[PDB]
Design a protein around this ligand. Sequence first.
Ligand SMILES: *[C@@H]1O[C@H](CO)[C@@H](O)[C@H](O)[C@H]1NC(C)=O
Ligand SMILES: *[C@@H]1O[C@H](CO)[C@@H](O)[C@H](O)[C@H]1NC(C)=O
Ligand SMILES: [Cl-]
Ligand SMILES: [Cl-]
Lengths: 368, 368
Amino acid sequence: NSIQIGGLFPRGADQEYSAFRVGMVQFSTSEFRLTPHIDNLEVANSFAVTNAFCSQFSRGVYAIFGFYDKKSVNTITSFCGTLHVSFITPSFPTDGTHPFVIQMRPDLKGALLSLIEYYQWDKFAYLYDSDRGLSTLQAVLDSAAEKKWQVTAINVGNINNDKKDEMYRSLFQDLELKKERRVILDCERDKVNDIVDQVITIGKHVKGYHYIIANLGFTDGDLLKIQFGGANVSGFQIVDYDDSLVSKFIERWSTLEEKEYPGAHTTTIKYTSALTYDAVQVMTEAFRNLRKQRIEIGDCLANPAVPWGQGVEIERALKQVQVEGLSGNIKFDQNGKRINYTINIMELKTNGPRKIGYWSEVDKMVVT
Amino acid sequence: NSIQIGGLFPRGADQEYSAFRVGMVQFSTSEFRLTPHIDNLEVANSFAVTNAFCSQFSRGVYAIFGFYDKKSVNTITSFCGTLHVSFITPSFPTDGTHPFVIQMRPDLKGALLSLIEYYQWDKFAYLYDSDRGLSTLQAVLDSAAEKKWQVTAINVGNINNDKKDEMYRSLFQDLELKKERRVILDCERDKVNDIVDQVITIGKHVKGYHYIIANLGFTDGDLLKIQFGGANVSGFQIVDYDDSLVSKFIERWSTLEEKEYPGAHTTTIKYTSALTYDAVQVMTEAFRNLRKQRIEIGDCLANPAVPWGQGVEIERALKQVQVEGLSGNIKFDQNGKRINYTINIMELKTNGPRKIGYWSEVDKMVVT
Ligand SMILES: *[C@@H]1O[C@H](CO)[C@@H](O)[C@H](O)[C@H]1NC(C)=O
Ligand SMILES: *[C@@H]1O[C@H](CO)[C@@H](O)[C@H](O)[C@H]1NC(C)=O
Ligand SMILES: [Cl-]
Ligand SMILES: [Cl-]
C-alpha cells in the first residue's frame, strides 16, 4: 500500500537528496513504503514552484516534501493553506500563521540573541544577505532598541560580483576605523569566505576580531578550514556528533558509495541534509499513526477552489509526531513549528570546534 | 477595434477604480477603446493572485493593470517575466530586474535620504511596518553606516491590535527617555494615527517632536487633520495641485457624482488613484504608438511554458511612453522604473501644508 508523496528539490541539492534516499531505506517497511515523485527546480522561481506544486497536486500526492526561498515562500504558504496540502520542509522557518506547513528547521533567532548577550556585546556589525531572510534582522534591531546595542546593519546581499572589491572597501571603512571588530555573519556560506578573506587581505587587527556565524551548521563543510588568523569564532549546531543516534547514522553514512549517494562517504552531514532525513522519519511516522488509528486516506486553478477533504487529518498526524532524529528531539506546535528542541553553542578552539553549551526556548543559554 | 486588458484591484480600492474609469473616459477615442476585465481580490493572497493572473492570460489580454503587495509581488514578477505579459502598477516599486513590470510609482528612498540630510538629523527613530516593504529600511540602515547616523529601527508591523497598548509602552520607553524626538513613519496610514495618538496620550514634549511621513501622499485624506500638538511634520507629494494639468483634472473630479464615482467629488485625489489614472494614459499611448508604427498584435501552467510572442513589442511600447500626468513627468527606463520625475517636499506650516522644495534623481533636493 504505497503512499504517494512529492519531493521538490533545488537543483544541485545533491547531499540533501542522498539523505532523503537513505531515509526512505531506513524508515520504509516491507508492507508500507513512501513513493516519491521528484521535481528538481529553481526554487527562487515562483512560476516554476507553482507549476511543480500544481503538478504534484494533480497527481494526487498525500503530502509534499520540499524547499522554498525568500521569493517562493509565499507561493508555498498560500497554495498549501488554500488546498490543504501539507508541505514538510528544511527551509527557513516563518513566524506568521501557516496552516499546512511543517517547518523542520528550528528557529535560531532566540539562540542568537542569547549568545550576543552571553558574550556581553553592546556594539557590533550585523552583515546579512538580502538574498536571505530578514526575520533575524528585525529581531536584532528590535533587541538593540531594548538592550541599547549599537548595531551597524549592512545588507551585504546583492553584490554584483564586480563592484564587490570596493563594496567591501566602503564596508570595512565604516567598521575597521570605528574599531568595530565584533561581527555577526548572517548570509550564504560563500559570502562568509568572501567577507573573511577581505579582513585578512587588508591585514589589520586580524586576530582581534570575534565572529558569530548565524546558521545551524557551524562545522558544516570546510567552513572552518578558512584562515581566520587567530580571530575568535562562534556558532550553532543542531546535529550533535556525540549523540548515540547521530553516531549510529554516521556509521552507515561514512561507508556509502559516493557514486550512488553524492555527498555521503563522510563523517559529517550538512544540517539541511540531516533535516531532510528527519523529515522522512516524520512523514513515515505520521502515515503509520494514521494506519494505527484506522483513518482511511486535482486542478490547482479549479474555481471554486476544492481543498482536499482529508488534508486536515494528515496535517494533524504530522504535527503530532514526536521522535528523536539527527536534529535532536523533534516535536511540533499547532503552527508546524519545532518546539522543545536544543541548539548546541560552539566555539572554535585550539583543538577544533568545541561545544561550550546549549540553548532551548525554556532555559535559554546553559554553559557546559 | 477594442483592446482587451485585465484589471486586478484590491477589494475596497474604490477611489482607485473610480480614477481608472475616469481615465478610460478621458483617454479613449471613438475608434479605439480599452476593454477591461476586472477582478477584485485579496492581493495578499498568492493563490488568488495566481488564479486571477492565469484567468486573464487565458482570456487573451494584451496587458494587465493591477496591484500587488509584499506577499504576492513575486508571483506577479515571475509570471509576467515567464509569460511575457506586461503588468502596469501603482504598487511599491522593486529594485531587482523585472522584465514586463511597469512601475508607475516613483522610488522614494532617495528623496527620503536627502530630506534626512537636509534637516541635518544624526539620531532618529525609524518606525516601519513589517506589513509593508523593507527596501527603505535597508537603504536607511546602509546610509546610517556611511553617514554615521544613530538609527533606532523598530518594526511596528504585526501588532495584535491587542497587546498594542503596551507594545507602544515599550516602544516609547526606548524613545521618550532617550530623548529621541525625530521620528520617521514608514507604515500604513492607520498605524500613523495609532502612533501619533500614543505621543499626545502620554503627553511629554509633544511639540518638541519632528515627524517625517515616508509616503508619496502627504496631504492625502484627513492624514493632516490629526492633532500633532504643535510638532513639526514633513513629507512628500507627487501630485502638485498648483500644476495646470492637475488643476484641470480636479475641475472635473470635483464635480463627479459620488454614487457613480466613489471617492470622487473632492478637490484632492490619493496618489495611488492618481497613478491609476496615469496608468490608463500610459496604456492608451502605448497601444496608439503600436498602431502608428503599424505593428499588428492560453494555459498558465502549460508545459513547456509558451510565452506570448508579441509580448516584447507591447512591453517596449509601454516603456517608451513619455507624457505628463497627474504624477508629473512620466518616463521609464528599460527596467520599467520611473525616471526624470520630481517629488515635492512638504512641511505642515501655520496656514497648512506647504511645498518647500523638490527632489529629482539628478539634482537631489532643491529649496524653493
Ligand atoms: C516544551 O516546550 C514548551 C513551549 O516552549 C515549554 O513550555 C515546555 O516547558 C517544554 N518542555 C520541556 C520539558 O522542556
Ligand atoms: C533624466 O534622467 C537621467 C537618469 O536619471 C539623467 O541622467 C538625465 O540627466 C535626466 N534628464 C534631465 C533633463 O533631468
Ligand atoms: Cl586599536
Ligand atoms: Cl528634555
